[PDB]
Amino acid sequence: TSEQRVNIATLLTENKKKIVDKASQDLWRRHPDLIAPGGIAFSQRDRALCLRDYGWFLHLITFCLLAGDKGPIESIGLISIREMYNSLGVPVPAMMESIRCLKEASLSLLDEEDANETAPYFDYIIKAMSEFHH
Amino acid sequence: EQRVNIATLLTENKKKIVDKASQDLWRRHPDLIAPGGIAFSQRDRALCLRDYGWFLHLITFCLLAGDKGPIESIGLISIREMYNVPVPAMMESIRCLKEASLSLLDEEDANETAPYFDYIIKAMSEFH
Ligand SMILES: [Cl-]
Ligand SMILES: [Cl-]
């Protein structure tokens, strides 16, 4: 329900796969322990599950931005956070770092007003992820 | 009120729903995983799984919001970008996604949820 938010959602929808690929490669360059033996992205099936989870988080951010509401993050977003922590064994700082890389890869396609409008959604998901053990 | 519970159910089981739907679709259309198909190689299968997941997530979000506007908004955008992957395979994939999703609901939940799958299938049939 906004012109600029519709344009940003369009950009994030056209480039969802490229954004996820760039963000994941950045994250695995920065954090070599994730693709090391014992890491959450060592094997191929684990890597595919990580890519699908990062994609889900990007989609949720894009939907919340298109809507203009951050409610869905506190609703179904926490369910996905808990599922990624529990089922995939992803430590909280790895989830935050993945969302941060997703944020930077997404804002690399926008300008300045768009990036300022978009960043609070990534930031809110990061905040929801960091207060998990509380 | 109920839609938050339905969206929670589809989010807790997003991976299982997508897996069941994709396996059902590939049993139904064996040409998809045959040589030349869009799900033949392993990377092809991963990309197909991510696309089906995106469609399921859009449906789940439209159900959580109660609005189908985003379908006419970014759904057609993604369809056009992904095609320029054949379009008529997407239809049956959404049908399988719907069946796998409704297998987890009852009767009121399924009756409330199915119209979103129906709308995305109908919007996807008007593509040229
Ligand atoms: Cl901690
Ligand atoms: Cl940051």
Author numbering:
A (entry chain A): 3 to 136
B (entry chain B): 5 to 88, 92 to 135
Question: What is written in the article reporting this PDB entry?
Answer:
Our previous efforts to develop a far-red FP with improved performance relative to other FPs yielded the small Ultra-Red FP (smURFP), which we created from the α-allophycocyanin phycobiliprotein through 12 rounds of directed evolution. Unlike α-allophycocyanin phycobiliprotein which requires a lyase to attach the chromophore, smURFP formed a covalent bond with BV via a cysteine residue without needing a lyase. Furthermore, smURFP is small (16 kD) relative to the GFP (27 kD), and yet its molecular brightness is equivalent to the enhanced GFP (eGFP) with a fluorescence quantum yield (QY) of 18% and a large extinction coefficient (EC) of 180,000 M−1 cm−1 at 642 nm1,11,12. smURFP was successfully incorporated into genetically encoded far-red and near-IR ubiquitination-based cell cycle indicator (FUCCI)11 and Förster resonance energy transfer (FRET) kinase sensor. The structure reveals that smURFP is a homodimer, and polar, π-π, and hydrophobic interactions mediate dimer formation.
On the other hand, apo-smURFP crystallized from a solution of smURFP with 20% BV attached, enabling us to determine the structure at 2.8 Å resolution. We observed that the asymmetric unit contains a hexamer with three smURFP homodimers. Importantly, the smURFP chromophore pocket is formed by amino acids from both protomers, which agreed with our previous directed evolution studies that indicated that the dimer was required for BV incorporation. The comparison of the chromophore pockets revealed that the pocket in the smURFP Y56F mutant was larger at 663 Å3 with disordered loops compared to smURFP, which forms a smaller pocket (576 Å3) with a compact and rigid secondary structure.
